[PDB]
Design a protein around this ligand. Sequence first.
Ligand SMILES: *[C@@H]1O[C@H](CO)[C@@H](O[C@@H]2O[C@H](CO)[C@@H](O[C@@H]3O[C@H](CO[C@H]4O[C@H](CO)[C@@H](O)[C@H](O[C@H]5O[C@H](CO)[C@@H](O)[C@H](O)[C@@H]5O)[C@@H]4O)[C@@H](O)[C@H](O[C@H]4O[C@H](CO)[C@@H](O)[C@H](O)[C@@H]4O)[C@@H]3O)[C@H](O)[C@H]2NC(C)=O)[C@H](O)[C@H]1NC(C)=O
Ligand SMILES: *[C@@H]1O[C@H](CO)[C@@H](O[C@@H]2O[C@H](CO)[C@@H](O[C@@H]3O[C@H](CO)[C@@H](O)[C@H](O)[C@@H]3O)[C@H](O)[C@H]2NC(C)=O)[C@H](O)[C@H]1NC(C)=O
Ligand SMILES: *[C@@H]1O[C@H](CO)[C@@H](O[C@@H]2O[C@H](CO)[C@@H](O)[C@H](O)[C@H]2NC(C)=O)[C@H](O)[C@H]1NC(C)=O
Ligand SMILES: *[C@@H]1O[C@H](CO)[C@@H](O[C@@H]2O[C@H](CO)[C@@H](O)[C@H](O)[C@H]2NC(C)=O)[C@H](O)[C@H]1NC(C)=O
Ligand SMILES: *[C@@H]1O[C@H](CO)[C@@H](O)[C@H](O)[C@H]1NC(C)=O
Ligand SMILES: *[C@@H]1O[C@H](CO)[C@@H](O)[C@H](O)[C@H]1NC(C)=O
Ligand SMILES: *[C@@H]1O[C@H](CO)[C@@H](O)[C@H](O)[C@H]1NC(C)=O
Ligand SMILES: *[C@@H]1O[C@H](CO)[C@@H](O)[C@H](O)[C@H]1NC(C)=O
Ligand SMILES: *[C@@H]1O[C@H](CO)[C@@H](O)[C@H](O)[C@H]1NC(C)=O
Ligand SMILES: [Ca+2]
Ligand SMILES: [Ca+2]
Ligand SMILES: [Ca+2]
Ligand SMILES: [Ca+2]
Ligand SMILES: [Ca+2]
Ligand SMILES: [Ca+2]
Ligand SMILES: [Mg+2]
Lengths: 11, 589, 455
Amino acid sequence: HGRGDLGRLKK
Amino acid sequence: FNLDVDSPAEYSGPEGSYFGFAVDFFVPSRMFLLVGAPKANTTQPGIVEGGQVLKCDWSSTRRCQPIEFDATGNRDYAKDDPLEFKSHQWFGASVRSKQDKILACAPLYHWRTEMKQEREPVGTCFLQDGTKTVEYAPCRSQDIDADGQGFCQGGFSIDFTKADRVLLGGPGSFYWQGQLISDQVAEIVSKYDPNVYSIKYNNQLATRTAQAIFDDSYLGYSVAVGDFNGDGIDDFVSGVPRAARTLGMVYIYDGKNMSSLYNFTGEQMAAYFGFSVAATDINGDDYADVFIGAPLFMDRGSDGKLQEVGQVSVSLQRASGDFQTTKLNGFEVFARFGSAIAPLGDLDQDGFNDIAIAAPYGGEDKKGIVYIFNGRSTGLNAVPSQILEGQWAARSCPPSFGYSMKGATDIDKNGYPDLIVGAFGVDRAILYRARPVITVNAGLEVYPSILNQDNKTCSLPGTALKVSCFNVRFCLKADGKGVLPRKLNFQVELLLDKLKGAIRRALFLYSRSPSHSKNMTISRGGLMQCEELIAYLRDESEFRDKLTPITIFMEYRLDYRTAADTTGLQPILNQFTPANISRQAHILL
Amino acid sequence: GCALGGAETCEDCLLIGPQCAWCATENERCDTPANLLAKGCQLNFIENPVSQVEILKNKPLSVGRQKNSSDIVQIAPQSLILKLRPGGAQTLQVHVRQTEDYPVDLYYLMDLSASMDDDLNTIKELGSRLSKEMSKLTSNFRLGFGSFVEKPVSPFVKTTPEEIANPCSSIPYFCLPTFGFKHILPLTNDAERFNEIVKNQKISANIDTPEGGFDAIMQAAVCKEKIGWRNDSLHLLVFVSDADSHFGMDSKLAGIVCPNDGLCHLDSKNEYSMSTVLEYPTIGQLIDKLVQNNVLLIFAVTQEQVHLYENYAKLIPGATVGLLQKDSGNILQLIISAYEELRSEVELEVLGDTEGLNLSFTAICNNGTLFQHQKKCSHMKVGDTASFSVTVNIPHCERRSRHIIIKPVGLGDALELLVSPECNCDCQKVEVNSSKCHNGNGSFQCGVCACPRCE
Ligand SMILES: *[C@@H]1O[C@H](CO)[C@@H](O[C@@H]2O[C@H](CO)[C@@H](O[C@@H]3O[C@H](CO[C@H]4O[C@H](CO)[C@@H](O)[C@H](O[C@H]5O[C@H](CO)[C@@H](O)[C@H](O)[C@@H]5O)[C@@H]4O)[C@@H](O)[C@H](O[C@H]4O[C@H](CO)[C@@H](O)[C@H](O)[C@@H]4O)[C@@H]3O)[C@H](O)[C@H]2NC(C)=O)[C@H](O)[C@H]1NC(C)=O
Ligand SMILES: *[C@@H]1O[C@H](CO)[C@@H](O[C@@H]2O[C@H](CO)[C@@H](O[C@@H]3O[C@H](CO)[C@@H](O)[C@H](O)[C@@H]3O)[C@H](O)[C@H]2NC(C)=O)[C@H](O)[C@H]1NC(C)=O
Ligand SMILES: *[C@@H]1O[C@H](CO)[C@@H](O[C@@H]2O[C@H](CO)[C@@H](O)[C@H](O)[C@H]2NC(C)=O)[C@H](O)[C@H]1NC(C)=O
Ligand SMILES: *[C@@H]1O[C@H](CO)[C@@H](O[C@@H]2O[C@H](CO)[C@@H](O)[C@H](O)[C@H]2NC(C)=O)[C@H](O)[C@H]1NC(C)=O
Ligand SMILES: *[C@@H]1O[C@H](CO)[C@@H](O)[C@H](O)[C@H]1NC(C)=O
Ligand SMILES: *[C@@H]1O[C@H](CO)[C@@H](O)[C@H](O)[C@H]1NC(C)=O
Ligand SMILES: *[C@@H]1O[C@H](CO)[C@@H](O)[C@H](O)[C@H]1NC(C)=O
Ligand SMILES: *[C@@H]1O[C@H](CO)[C@@H](O)[C@H](O)[C@H]1NC(C)=O
Ligand SMILES: *[C@@H]1O[C@H](CO)[C@@H](O)[C@H](O)[C@H]1NC(C)=O
Ligand SMILES: [Ca+2]
Ligand SMILES: [Ca+2]
Ligand SMILES: [Ca+2]
Ligand SMILES: [Ca+2]
Ligand SMILES: [Ca+2]
Ligand SMILES: [Ca+2]
Ligand SMILES: [Mg+2]
């Protein structure tokens, strides 16, 4: 759940 | 239907260079062909397959010459710190020309951020007006990374307006929401500065970043221009093939303030509605019409099964603001009909603009097919009047004949617009020239058409016995638009009692024969040429068939070999027009 | 009616209508048979090539768990010859029944994007748990494994040296470099082998949210020998992802403009070697290959993707969608539910030379009720029979016959159809220069002299 494929890990 | 397929001009480039991925014309008093070869090796220092755009001459010899937009290698941001990456940038992936301006782009051009050391595909364009050449990279800004214009790939699609404004498409902006950027050609060259990598243009029109739900839409995937609010200013049309959950959409924006005007939506998932778009008035009402390609559309047959055939929607712009939309389905499975849509102008000069639609992977051996469609008062004629076939077999990429094409330019001053068709898979580009169109008005009178067998008027030479006779008169008149000869030589045949193995009831007086051949030289523009002739009925005792009508048949053809022009371009008879006519006579009962 | 045709040739008489007949006697000869016998025609001379069927192989449907696989019959009949007069349609009664115990193949195709890290911790023992439940429902269960992320090319992936070596170098987090599709485990009975394969998986990453799943789906369906699909068994392809998918000409952004060929491109390392060469497959291409390889596609996707993949599934025969949790906690239930769903669904499919042919379907599901314009049955207990009325018609007289296959979606059993047109008479088998037409001035055929003789 986030913007981009790295969304979850970025959060 | 009038495109010359016997001897079309074949241009070729280096193998593997994708020569023909993008094509256009160049009309500065000489004429030229513009071909994109995005995978072409250049002499640029350290740059492998930078790509190039070749200027090919149509006149006399067939010579393509590379156009030097940029001879330099990678500029440095700092010492041992390259600013850009021009290798494999696909320069010439899109080429667009207007008068003395040539715009070519490199969608896969990457550059270094001026903050950190990145490699972001912002895309770049070079604009060449006569002598001055400038760079144009509107996505190469301070708005970096995917959230911004970092992956914009500006110049993925481009176009010119009629007031010398550029329309550029960038499908990757704002996490692939896509973007349209529009600048006036004067500011592009004027505000250009070789020491500034992010140039601000004052009169720039651009779509803005929207909500995250609109990510992965690919706005700017394709573009086209045309007026749609009747203010004379070309408005922006663009395909957004992944919008609406892969249903695909097409956005229309006002060409003055980038305000939203109209929307189109696909009717099938993942049909790639919006892969290609085009805008041209097809029904002669001076209202531009929208053509949207969806090459992956699946249609159901009589057997009920889905088949991928592709679809183009034709949307006729009403004065009321609405669109009267029809749909045109492809013919061959997996051929991807609708991959390219090229306005041809008035290909046959009948008063209505025409359009070409390609199925680049159709035909035998996947050699590509191009379909020609003619306009009329009621819109586009759904049945194609000509089928253009690819001639070149595949070795690894398919030939992709039709993948790019350009029309609406009269390159040979023949009064008719011609057509360029690219086939990058075989590194080839082909110019098809339009043949001049002859409209013929042929006539056939049979008087009297009711025949009294008992009349016997005309005496016959050698016998005292008179026969029942009547007059057969056939007329011929022709004319055409553009450059065609004055003197047209026709060959005309007449056959009496045509639907008769069975015996011929009517014969010509002088020849005593049912058939008559005649050479007829007529002048274009000129008066009608006629020839009268006498035919007679057989004696009443000679046949038992009195009820069946005696059909007089007239057939005519042209000398194409002798009507040709200095370039060997042979004219052609207008379609829908009968190369023969028939009239029948009856015997009295 | 059948009159006013022309009465030129018996052959042309059959063209104007399937109800029309010819009287090849010298005793508007083209007319209906009810009319012809009364008009003064003969019994042996009325030529009526009527449409008919000839059952070749019609074995009764087996039911009730059979130990011998070759005795299993799930469709009836199995072989048919269909002689069709042009215009005269014929309705086939096709019966389908699923057997109690039948081999199932399962290929677990998992998204290994950075958003799928939490999912992995829970699947570490999915293998033994899945094969334990499936053991109850079938005696031959086989699982395999494959993974995917994305085409490892710009702009789908950042291409700086650091980002290539570790695409989660920006988080900063440790991930494997992006790869297209890896076929790790060939389908086997050892469920324990599946477990160990999962615990060794490592997460990747890229940029854009949709992924390159369709590349993997295509490869999984086509590569039969490599993946290990059994011949007479259910082929289940479970697609696990929390993202949209790239398709078709999305790869133009990456400069990939050569269409997918639907061929197997798994190298010595069992990796998709055309990931950077060929485009993403199209839905039409996936449909084509899934049907040809009889592969049933299960979309285990999260809430945000459910509705999107539902629409895809409606185009793909045999495809279903299961709501996957954020941590894939329910993948067991989804697979079993889906399996039991296909276990009660019966879809007909018509393959082969069916172009230019009129086909219509009515489904006799459950209680006996009939569904018009439908070739699909649902809510069936395993053992229940589904009957379909397939109506076949040839519009115009053809030259060569048509090879057609009617089969249930997902099942191996099939109904072969040899549709051969009948547009010719027996009378045209013609006396050149016969003595019947004035000393051989013409040929005699079909009761009429072809030079009313030449006298
Ligand atoms: C054709 O189809 C396209 C595609 O749908 C249509 O284009 C869409 O049109 C709609 C309607 O106009 C657009 O919705 C608007 O979105 C803007 C977004 O503004 C952005 O920029 C702001 C800074 O300038 C920023 O503040 C905004 O952030 C807000 O939104 C986020 C959402 O999560 C929120 O978290 C923030 O806190 C902000 O609130 C945003 O980033 C928005 O400004 C518009 O507001 C209008 O509507 C609201 C409704 O309540 C109203 O209150 C406002 O006064 C204003 O009227 C509106 O929401 C959408 O963005 C367009 N999409 C694209 C891709 O362009 C197009 O209209 C169709 N044409 C036709 C003819 O049908
Ligand atoms: C018997 O046969 C003769 C010969 O065909 C018929 O004479 C023909 O008469 C017509 C009419 O006068 C002539 O044709 C033309 O008449 C039109 C007017 O309709 C005129 O405008 C034309 O330009 C042309 O003059 C025709 O020349 C003439 N035929 C010949 C060979 O001279 C006659 O009518 C027949 N009689 C009957 C009772 O049918
Ligand atoms: C963008 O430009 C168009 C065209 O110049 C504007 O259209 C006008 O809209 C007003 C009402 O909003 C009408 O009264 C005018 O007749 C329209 N003019 C034309 C030529 O169509 C539009 O309003 C502009 N929008 C913005 C946001 O600037
Ligand atoms: C005279 O011209 C007509 C057309 O005016 C020809 O008719 C063609 O008939 C065939 C029948 O299969 C059609 O497929 C063609 O399309 C028709 N032609 C056109 C131009 O539409 C007719 O055959 C011609 N007669 C002779 C003797 O040549
Ligand atoms: C360009 O040159 C490079 C040199 O390594 C070569 O590999 C490549 O194939 C060339 N491109 C074409 C289109 O020939
Ligand atoms: C008409 O002229 C052509 C050449 O111009 C000739 O070949 C042909 O025989 C001529 N027709 C007749 C009927 O003599
Ligand atoms: C003609 O029909 C009659 C019956 O009406 C039959 O008896 C006779 O044999 C037929 N003639 C021939 C030659 O078949
Ligand atoms: C299954 O039964 C058939 C006929 O009853 C027989 O020919 C076949 O050998 C059996 N299967 C095996 C594996 O023996
Ligand atoms: C599997 O089935 C296919 C089609 O039914 C057949 O062509 C093939 O020979 C079979 N192979 C084996 C190993 O049974
Ligand atoms: Ca406008
Ligand atoms: Ca119009
Ligand atoms: Ca026209
Ligand atoms: Ca021309
Ligand atoms: Ca997760
Ligand atoms: Ca992705
Ligand atoms: Mg992901």
